[PDB]
Enzyme design. Structure first.
Site, PDB file in Angstrom:
ATOM      1  N   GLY A   1       0.648  -1.139   0.030  1.00  0.00           N
ATOM      2  CA  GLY A   1       0.287   0.107  -0.096  1.00  0.00           C
ATOM      3  C   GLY A   1       1.227   1.196  -0.129  1.00  0.00           C
TER       4      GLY A   1
ATOM      5  N   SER B   1      -4.919   1.523  14.028  1.00  0.00           N
ATOM      6  CA  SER B   1      -5.706   2.544  14.236  1.00  0.00           C
ATOM      7  C   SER B   1      -6.106   2.716  15.829  1.00  0.00           C
ATOM      8  CB  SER B   1      -6.692   2.900  13.088  1.00  0.00           C
ATOM      9  OG  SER B   1      -7.501   3.359  13.379  1.00  0.00           O
TER      10      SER B   1
ATOM     11  N   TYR C   1     -14.330  -2.371  10.777  1.00  0.00           N
ATOM     12  CA  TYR C   1     -13.029  -1.679  10.456  1.00  0.00           C
ATOM     13  C   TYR C   1     -12.164  -1.653  11.744  1.00  0.00           C
ATOM     14  CZ  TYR C   1      -9.026   1.480   9.269  1.00  0.00           C
ATOM     15  OH  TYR C   1      -8.175   1.755   9.448  1.00  0.00           O
TER      16      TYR C   1
END
Lengths: 249, 249, 249, 250
Positions: free
Chosen positions: C12, C136, C149
């Site tokens: 990514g 995160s 998520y």
């Protein structure tokens, strides 16, 4: 030379992690001020560090020393960009054995002095300055006969979360370094008066670390230096734990 | 009933969470001792709570007061199955305005007093006894002008982790209840002296809770009773947070 | 300089935090391989990165793409000192609207692909290598309509804790960087197509950050670079959160 | 006790271990309980042993059609769901370097995906004030060699609750997580190995890791679930309650 032109103060600069941090910060070109209770230890640390590093004799537990210390910074440099508090101590007492004197010394050196060291530093600290507080994995774990010490370390970590909001207008960010077991006079002294007897304690602590070794103080100092630098601009209120994986697993 | 034959001590039993806990434990059939600083409140609270509840007037910060309280328990009942510490306070000071008296008052009442209330209790406590310490979501979060209070609550939670190890041979288990915002005289009084001032503060705090209401003190008391009972037999050193989801999200 | 002679792979790598990390690592002198799912975007990213940056077109979810990626790294550079997984996505579904495709797509890219990127990477990684996983603050917080998520990010952080033990004999250390809200095309896309809708959404997110700004991706990239460097030698299984204080308070 | 009287509870994975102990404790409190099991014979023994108005539905939570059939019996019979406890979950060991795609897929499909869709399908049945308890583990917040996939799945379960607080806040449903430490269960025993000696040695070693020095009886974990299911937990939301003997706290 990333920290060149930056002024840093390390309380408890004479030994252990603070010593290595003062050395690491000095390598970056940061003018460093270190504090010790005992002149000869401070002189040896200042002579050992060199690198444009100044030392002030000072006991964090008395306001006059703190006032004199920051008055020295105002008269000489007059701005503080980096603050690291390493003046804390650990002593062992099991519950049922804890003395009122033992509680008072631990929290005064480990918590109260951090509060007033930070409070007195603030006028000297510009916007964008970095504060690094002394934490421990002991703050978030259980260790026998070490409840008072662990509670004091957890309190230090909590101060940063609220101080984020108190210092937000001033642009100063507060972060916490939490070491695992690190090779230091303080750790060896805890192990025992005997040289081999304390050495056995150090061998046991290394066995508890997942990577299997105690830290060199420089490895902890690198974490403080990183928080001191502008690379940590978006880090605030965070705890960075260098423990070899001990508390993570 | 569930807790009959059990002896419980609640410090700060006269108001707020401690009072609701005294009521709940007494309803379970426990003998309850509650402490209050003011005799009229202590008397009135004992009157309402019931035959099971008795009241001793003590200031947990005074070593003599703690010694006196435990000594009456030794002669009156002779054992202590349940201990819940609710003698604690909060006051506001932002960094830069923190006074030394403000630091000492809060830490002596919230941390030091807990250490010695627990230490003095231990000889009375049998195997399988339960200790519940008063924590806060403030211990784990940042609140502007409440750094000293949060640090004290974080220290309280950390104590339990080490005390698990200290008390493991004794068979006493230590846990922490951490309330979110709870409607109490103490919460109202932080809001202000004006009643529109408390009402505005209380409504704003409820807006912070995800379920949208402040807790009734009984809802926190239910958590203490569970930890006090044998149902929590495999819970040790843990924190149970009742905040309406505020710190969880 | 510091990373000179180190080979780094960033999955990514074409956009956002991954792009900033590729640039910072190459600036430190690492040879960098970046992965992109789409060819046109991958070529443009490599060209902006320029020297010290190689591109391989691969989708993390496909296993053949992973085999081709590690075969080329083995054939060319022959070792992998640094691995950073940034190939992950966030999608919106409230509870009661979640689809099976929505669950599968998130977990295959955010969790499963991380497991197999790391597993296939291991033969190339020498002793002392550093792996950084994308976390995160969503992993440790609650966000409406983002539950899947957040769960995927929590799974990512958890992998590191066990992987410390799995990897201890190999000498490879695993750590997690957890960003707060960072200015990214993806984050703007989550706000929506309307440019005004993106700007309003980004302005709302900055209001949540205590320091009051979204992060520039470089501010996250510095954390990955620090963990990638030998300064992080005593850090293992840890999470470093760069959130401006949002989750710390 | 009758604290839970008039309440309907569903326990997935009710036939064994903590789920069975929970069904028993909820039933003793006066709840109507529905339990699910994969195998009919085991399900029959659990329903017969539990007695007390407990009904069993044979279903596999990973199969979407089974879930639809299961909630259809609840809609046709009880008409509501006050309490939900998801205990249909498994652990298998694979170290990094040996983790297979099937090992990853089986764990996450049973431990996480089935939880999401069990909860999603339950919601229309759940009134305001209903309570959801998710099965977590201390393995979710700790490191264990060769158990990374399992620990990741439990950490995912715990995170689901934090966001679901917000998703469910107008419905008035509260979501919480019980995280057990080492608890004496046939699954835990079987994880030790086929041999009784292999199970016994592993079980004795795990007990040594617990600070209080013993594995939990399943009823000790069930007590935590009953507390969360009851109205006493009215101010608890999104929280994790860890019953580990102190293992993860120290």
């Amino acid at each position: 030379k990333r920290l060149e032109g930056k002024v840093a103060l390390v309380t408890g600069g004479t030994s252990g992690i603070g010593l290595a941090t003062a050395k690491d910060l000095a390598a970056q070109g940061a003018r460093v001020i270190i504090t010790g209770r005992r002149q000869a230890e401070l002189d040896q640390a200042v002579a050992a560090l060199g690198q444009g590093v100044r030392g002030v004799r000072s006991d964090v537990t008395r306001s006059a020393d703190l006032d004199a210390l920051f008055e020295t910074i105002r008269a000489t440099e007059g701005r503080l960009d980096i603050l690291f508090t390493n003046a804390g101590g650990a002593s062992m007492a099991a519950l049922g054995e804890i003395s009122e004197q033992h509680f008072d010394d631990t929290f005064e050196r480990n918590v109260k002095a951090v509060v007033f060291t930070v409070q007195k530093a603030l006028p000297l600290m510009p916007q964008g300055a970095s504060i690094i507080l002394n934490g421990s994995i002991k703050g978030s774990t259980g260790t026998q006969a070490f409840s008072i010490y662990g509670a004091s370390k957890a309190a230090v970590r909590a101060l940063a979360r609220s101080w984020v909001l108190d210092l937000k207008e001033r642009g100063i960010r507060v972060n916490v370094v939490s070491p695992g077991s690190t090779r230091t006079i303080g750790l060896a002294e805890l192990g025992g008066d005997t040289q081999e007897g304390q050495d056995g304690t150090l061998a046991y602590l290394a066995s508890l670390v997942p990577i299997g070794r105690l830290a060199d103080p420089s490895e902890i100092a690198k974490v403080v230096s990183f928080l001191a630098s502008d690379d940590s601009s978006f880090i605030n209120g965070a705890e960075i734990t260098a423990d070899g994986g001990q508390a993570q697993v």
